[PDB]
Ligand binder design. Sequence first.
Ligand SMILES: CC(C)[C@H](C(=O)Nc1ccc(C(=O)NO)cc1)c1ccccc1
Ligand SMILES: CC(C)[C@H](C(=O)Nc1ccc(C(=O)NO)cc1)c1ccccc1
Lengths: 306, 306
Amino acid sequence: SGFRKMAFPSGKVEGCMVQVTCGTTTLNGLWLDDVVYCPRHVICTSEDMLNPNYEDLLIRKSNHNFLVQAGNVQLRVIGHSMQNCVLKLKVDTANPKTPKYKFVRIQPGQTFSVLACYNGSPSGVYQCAMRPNFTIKGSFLNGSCGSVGFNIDYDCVSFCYMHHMELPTGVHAGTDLEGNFYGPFVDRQTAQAAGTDTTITVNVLAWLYAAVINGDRWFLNRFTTTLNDFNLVAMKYNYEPLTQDHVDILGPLSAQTGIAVLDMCASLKELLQNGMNGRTILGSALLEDEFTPFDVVRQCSGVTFQ
Amino acid sequence: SGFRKMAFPSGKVEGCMVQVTCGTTTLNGLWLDDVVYCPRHVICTSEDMLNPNYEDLLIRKSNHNFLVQAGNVQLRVIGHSMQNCVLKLKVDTANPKTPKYKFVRIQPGQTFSVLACYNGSPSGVYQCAMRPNFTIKGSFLNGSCGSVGFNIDYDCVSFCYMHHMELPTGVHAGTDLEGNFYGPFVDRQTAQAAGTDTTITVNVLAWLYAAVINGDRWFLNRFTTTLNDFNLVAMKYNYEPLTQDHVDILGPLSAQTGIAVLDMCASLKELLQNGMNGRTILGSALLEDEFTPFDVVRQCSGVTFQ
Ligand SMILES: CC(C)[C@H](C(=O)Nc1ccc(C(=O)NO)cc1)c1ccccc1
Ligand SMILES: CC(C)[C@H](C(=O)Nc1ccc(C(=O)NO)cc1)c1ccccc1
């Protein structure tokens, strides 16, 4: 028993992190097979970042200007190209530690693990969610760009995020590994503000099931509701509308606990309208929304990765 | 910016995890040099666990009864011995992935990362604190015994915890790597209840400094206090007494922010007496106490491990 915010084991990704330097700028890169992926703003100065013309800035760069270091050992760059907002640096050595991997573009509401790195070196690992406004709430300092987010299924690493930017409001924006930003954000130091940070309703419900499985049940009540009735309350509290697709996804947790999804929705409705009254659920005084239904099933059943 | 509950990169420990089977019981072991460490209750049946005589149960075990598997490859056991509540299984092959390591017995209030494993395979990583009542609040299912907790400094892994037991109340108990339990707990299925779960005051203060560094400052007020005055309030709220040693440890964070430790204590006092009034601090509605002062400095400065 016990339910914790849990990241994937990070060893498979640790062996892919390198340092990339272009001029005065150092950040992180991801070394898979004979390609190193990194944010294209490695080629910028701090001045450049206000209005960068990346195509023009890259004309002045040659292979030998990209210094790529894996631990203490230097990699030889034999080609470079820009794909959307990432650079692909072709090196003459395939990463011998390359795991089985895929590139995936995740949907808002899905979760992933971040390996925070500096100077190509891992600093820590934590769990994140792609928010409905396409930001993530991470922990990133200067030098952390190029840190990646990922999920693992058995022995295959699905890379879904690369870190690029911090907004003035303290939240974070980045791309998939094809270099396309999540949401409307751009790699320019400008006025770009995040939209409404809505709560991921299906994840809150999954976490309430996790609470019941682990013995926290004070919030269960005698009520039920309907999708349309619940969603009137969801809207008031900036919760994402619950759909029949979401109900179906919660089916397995419903079956295990014997609590119908709409009954749990009625529990959530009362929690939103009345608050916690100073009580806690799984050690939290907030309704947690960065556990997916699949996260809960996985942790409550103890699946592993080889 | 951003402040997250962050675990150490787990790759160095992943390469040390093995599966240990004795009869019908399978759990995890830690393979360092030519020794595998695991909980001694691997030799017990579920019946045995009510009143086990470990010395007598071990007489019936020989080296070849301990099946030790590293991934898909079997290790040969050439000796075994009991040290306190752990077994040390001598194998004929030194773990080629052995990192630089130490065994450490941590103090209540210190934090560490847990690599949750099943059948010798990593499942996830999360951050824990040794509570003042010598429990930890983990995420452990059947099969997770032998999972370990650790800190990393540069390239040296300090192992501090091995998981052994779940109490009927849902919290967790275990040993250091010399096999001595933290607190009064024993590896017997009996009535053993945890004492008062007091809050780690110095860690709460460190987290409040982290909040200020990251822009959350609504809780700062015009007041100050004294150690003795604060501790009268700490006692009422089951907070550990603050000492001059704690004040000194917070010195660096005090210097960086310009907020005197006793001024932050006055902010904490008001938060305890008045609550959060529906507001949040670093995404939490509770006063978080599983960040140490060293954790905060580390995350706010981005130190790494090679
Ligand atoms: C989302 C937030 C608005 C919600 C909440 O706080 N509701 C609340 C409603 C009414 C009162 C009151 O005092 N009425 O008189 C007090 C609190 C909530 C629920 C669960 C966990 C965190 C937050
Ligand atoms: C530890 C807990 C007891 C504390 C707290 O809730 N205090 C509180 C005090 C008075 C009232 C009230 O309504 N007075 O009229 C309401 C709440 C607290 C503080 C910060 C974060 C979590 C919890």
